[PDB]
Enzyme design. Structure first.
Site, PDB file in Angstrom:
ATOM      1  N   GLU A  47     -10.900   4.650   1.531  1.00 60.51           N
ATOM      2  CA  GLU A  47     -11.451   4.146   2.822  1.00 60.51           C
ATOM      3  C   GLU A  47     -12.900   4.608   2.987  1.00 60.51           C
ATOM      4  O   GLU A  47     -13.243   5.330   3.914  1.00 60.51           O
ATOM      5  CB  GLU A  47     -10.537   4.579   3.969  1.00 60.51           C
ATOM      6  CG  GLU A  47      -9.138   4.016   3.794  1.00 60.51           C
ATOM      7  CD  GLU A  47      -8.219   4.096   5.000  1.00 60.51           C
ATOM      8  OE1 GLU A  47      -8.461   4.934   5.915  1.00 60.51           O
ATOM      9  OE2 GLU A  47      -7.238   3.311   5.005  1.00 60.51           O
ATOM     10  N   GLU A  93      -2.235   1.140   0.137  1.00 62.04           N
ATOM     11  CA  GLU A  93      -1.819   2.008   1.268  1.00 62.04           C
ATOM     12  C   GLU A  93      -1.364   1.176   2.469  1.00 62.04           C
ATOM     13  O   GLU A  93      -2.135   0.318   2.946  1.00 62.04           O
ATOM     14  CB  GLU A  93      -2.964   2.915   1.714  1.00 62.04           C
ATOM     15  CG  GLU A  93      -2.542   4.020   2.665  1.00 62.04           C
ATOM     16  CD  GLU A  93      -3.729   4.733   3.292  1.00 62.04           C
ATOM     17  OE1 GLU A  93      -4.785   4.852   2.588  1.00 62.04           O
ATOM     18  OE2 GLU A  93      -3.598   5.227   4.452  1.00 62.04           O
ATOM     19  N   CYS A 121       1.393   1.950   6.102  1.00 64.22           N
ATOM     20  CA  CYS A 121       2.413   2.667   6.879  1.00 64.22           C
ATOM     21  C   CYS A 121       2.367   2.140   8.302  1.00 64.22           C
ATOM     22  O   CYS A 121       1.313   1.692   8.735  1.00 64.22           O
ATOM     23  CB  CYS A 121       2.256   4.183   6.853  1.00 64.22           C
ATOM     24  SG  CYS A 121       0.704   4.765   7.570  1.00 64.22           S
ATOM     25  N   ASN A 164       0.901 -10.721   0.821  1.00 63.47           N
ATOM     26  CA  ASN A 164       0.071 -10.192  -0.290  1.00 63.47           C
ATOM     27  C   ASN A 164       0.398 -10.957  -1.580  1.00 63.47           C
ATOM     28  O   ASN A 164      -0.534 -11.425  -2.238  1.00 63.47           O
ATOM     29  CB  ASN A 164       0.253  -8.678  -0.435  1.00 63.47           C
ATOM     30  CG  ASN A 164      -0.650  -7.878   0.480  1.00 63.47           C
ATOM     31  OD1 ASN A 164      -1.785  -7.600   0.129  1.00 63.47           O
ATOM     32  ND2 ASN A 164      -0.140  -7.442   1.629  1.00 63.47           N
TER      33      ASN A 164
HETATM   34  C1  LIG Z   1      -4.644   5.467   5.331  1.00 55.13           C
HETATM   35  O1  LIG Z   1      -4.070   5.407   6.644  1.00 55.13           O
HETATM   36  C2  LIG Z   1      -3.139   6.459   6.884  1.00 55.13           C
HETATM   37  C3  LIG Z   1      -2.637   6.250   8.304  1.00 55.13           C
HETATM   38  O2  LIG Z   1      -3.608   6.629   9.276  1.00 55.13           O
HETATM   39  C4  LIG Z   1      -3.806   7.807   6.694  1.00 55.13           C
HETATM   40  O3  LIG Z   1      -2.830   8.804   6.879  1.00 55.13           O
HETATM   41  C5  LIG Z   1      -4.455   7.934   5.319  1.00 55.13           C
HETATM   42  O4  LIG Z   1      -5.172   9.162   5.225  1.00 55.13           O
HETATM   43  C6  LIG Z   1      -5.397   6.764   5.149  1.00 55.13           C
HETATM   44  F1  LIG Z   1      -5.935   6.822   3.859  1.00 55.13           F
END
Ligand SMILES: *[C@H]1O[C@H](CO)[C@@H](O)[C@H](O)[C@H]1F
Ligand SMILES: *[C@@H]1O[C@H](CO)[C@@H](O[C@@H]2O[C@H](CO)[C@@H](O[C@@H]3O[C@H](CO[C@H]4O[C@H](CO)[C@@H](O)[C@H](O)[C@@H]4O)[C@@H](O)[C@H](O)[C@@H]3O)[C@H](O)[C@H]2NC(C)=O)[C@H](O)[C@H]1NC(C)=O
Ligand SMILES: *[C@@H]1O[C@H](CO)[C@@H](O)[C@H](O)[C@H]1NC(C)=O
Ligand SMILES: *[C@@H]1O[C@H](CO)[C@@H](O)[C@H](O)[C@H]1NC(C)=O
Length: 497
Positions: free
Chosen positions: A235, A340, A342, A370
């Site tokens: 990021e 990534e 979540c 995706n």
């Molecule tokens: C991607 O998002 C998650 C959720 O906020 C973070 O925990 C990670 O550090 C980030 F890379």
């Protein structure tokens, strides 16, 4: 196979309860005999990859929804599916008794579980750490003589990764990503907040940072772990933001382009790690196609870039066609990879919602969208968290497909786990996305893959409340008469020859 022991926590579905002596399991995947199909079904009502079989019919008549396989129409080849071995994940797994640890690791990495073949590994500390550290915190150590792996790697992450590899029958691909450099390489001298590398690409700060990647890979190689890929930064847009709360390192796309061209690309290419793939971006897909254009229109950067890593957090503001679709159109030979995801990180989301069917549907909807826009793989974040969604040194608590309840030597497999498994279990590396068209507008999400052996895999998600009767047509083989219940996910398998 051992069935789910269901438990409700008052949300829309159940978790499956595991402990030192019991965990639900699956059979290793197999295609059924030519002329039959397999259906794996999970439902909000509590079904967890229930296997049923049906006949393939030569003929079909009626006005119902038809999904027609276009097996000749080929898209991307699949790299795979997995999750992140964060400090927080490793602490939660290792807080279980050894037998419970083995059942959690089997849930993810064995063929009696969901057959993960990707592990993302943070390069030192992130928010999902309890300690802030890098591998080179001795100030002004440009030579990196004091580079070393702490116990978070040597005692927690590395031994768990070895145990995952020993359970996996599929080759596992490790993916490394850094959050912060040492603070003495940064404009702001802090792990978090707005700040970049000092100076400019091609200088001592940037050459030292590129060498830190090689020292990282050397150190993991001393521990008998080899990487498939690294990302250029986790990021990079985060470190451009005033008051960014946790470990980050800011790059504009121009800064990333020049860092890759001058420092990271040449340093990796001139090392024993030259075959390790480099992925750019590793950030929200809202930044595409602009970031891809800035980096990949420079031939000296483009020659080092294997792929474009994407995170899901702005998907709600970033239509897939305009981002993934347009990036694939402009750069069709540069793979797109989801690195990534979540639930729980957003202001409007509770961190953990035990048994949430909604969060399972978010995962499968994401993976299908995706796959329909050329993405070759999809990676979860923390493999396991505690019931608060931690630990996390900035209390950025989120959800995980497995929640560990240390006091009960228990872990809970959530709908997200099963929704992920509907893909990871049945879509080996080297599978190819093929066409699948609908006869009429419908509320289903579906994707078709051809298994490396030529067999068909179709995933059908119904995020509506309504049961949808449907037929799947394979022009070579015939018709699958089926039904997609409201709030269900199905994986269909059949041989074509
Ligand atoms: C991607 O998002 C998650 C959720 O906020 C973070 O925990 C990670 O550090 C980030 F890379
Ligand atoms: C680890 O988790 C295991 C699975 O949850 C735990 O085993 C369970 O322990 C409870 C309490 O002793 C038992 O519950 C009782 O269950 C019977 C009904 O048993 C049968 O039907 C159920 C439901 O389908 C089925 O799962 C069982 O296999 C039996 O055929 C009731 O009559 C009692 O009133 C009470 O509810 C479970 O039977 C038992 N489950 C299993 C699968 O063994 C185990 O205790 C946990 N271990 C630790 C260390 O905590
Ligand atoms: C399928 O349809 C064809 C074309 O009408 C028909 O001739 C054939 O007998 C049917 N086959 C079966 C197995 O019903
Ligand atoms: C860093 O490494 C050098 C060279 O091996 C050593 O002499 C020095 O004492 C180390 N410094 C720290 C803080 O460990």
């Amino acid at each position: 196979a051992r069935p789910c022991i269901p438990k409700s926590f008052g949300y829309s579905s159940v978790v499956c309860v595991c402990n030192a002596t019991y965990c639900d399991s699956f059979d290793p995947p197999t295609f059924p005999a030519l002329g039959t199909f397999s259906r794996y079904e999970s439902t909000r009502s509590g079904r967890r990859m229930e296997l049923s079989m049906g006949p393939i019919q030569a003929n079909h008549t009626g006005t119902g929804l038809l999904l027609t396989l276009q097996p000749e129409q080929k898209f991307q080849k699949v790299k795979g599916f997995g999750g992140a071995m964060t400090d927080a994940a490793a602490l939660n797994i290792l807080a279980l008794s050894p037998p419970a640890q083995n059942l959690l690791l089997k849930s993810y990495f064995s063929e009696e579980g969901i057959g993960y073949n990707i592990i993302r590994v943070p390069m030192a500390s992130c928010d999902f750490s309890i300690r802030t550290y890098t591998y080179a915190d001795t100030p002004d150590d440009f030579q990196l003589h004091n580079f070393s792996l702490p116990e978070e790697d040597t005692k927690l992450k590395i031994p768990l990764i070895h145990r995952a590899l020993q359970l996996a029958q599929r080759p596992v691909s490790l993916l490394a990503s850094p959050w912060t450099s040492p603070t003495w390489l940064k404009t702001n001298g802090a792990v978090n907040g707005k700040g970049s590398l000092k100076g400019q690409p091609g200088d001592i700060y940037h050459q030292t940072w590129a060498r830190y990647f090689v020292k990282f890979l050397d150190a993991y190689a001393e521990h008998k772990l080899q990487f498939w890929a690294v990302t250029a930064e986790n990021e990079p847009s985060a470190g451009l933001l005033s008051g960014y709360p946790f470990q980050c390192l800011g790059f504009t796309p121009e800064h990333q382009r020049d860092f890759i061209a001058r420092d990271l690309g040449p340093t990796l290419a001139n090392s024993t790690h030259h075959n390790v793939r480099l992925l750019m971006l590793d950030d929200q897909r809202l930044l595409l196609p602009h970031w891809a254009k800035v980096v990949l229109t420079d031939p000296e950067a483009a020659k080092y870039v294997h792929g474009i890593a994407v995170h899901w957090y702005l998907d709600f503001l970033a239509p897939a066609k305009a981002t993934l679709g347009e990036t694939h159109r402009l750069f069709p030979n540069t793979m797109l990879f989801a690195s990534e995801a979540c639930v729980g990180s957003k202001f409007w989301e509770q961190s953990v919602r035990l048994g949430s069917w909604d969060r399972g549907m978010q995962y499968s909807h994401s993976i299908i969208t995706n796959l329909l826009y050329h993405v070759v793989g999809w990676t979860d974040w923390n493999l396991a968290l505690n019931p608060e969604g931690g630990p996390n040194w900035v209390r950025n608590f989120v959800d995980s497909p497995i929640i560990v309840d240390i006091t009960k030597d228990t872990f809970y497999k959530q709908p997200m786990f099963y929704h992920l498994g509907h893909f990871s279990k049945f879509i080996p590396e080297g599978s190819q996305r093929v066409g699948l068209v609908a006869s009429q507008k419908n509320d289903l999400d579906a994707v078709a893959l051809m298994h490396p052996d030529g067999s068909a895999v179709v995933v059908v998600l119904n995020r509506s409340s309504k049961d949808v009767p449907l037929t799947i047509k394979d022009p070579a083989v015939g018709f699958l008469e089926t039904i997609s219940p409201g709030y269900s996910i199905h994986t269909y398998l059949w041989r074509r020859q």
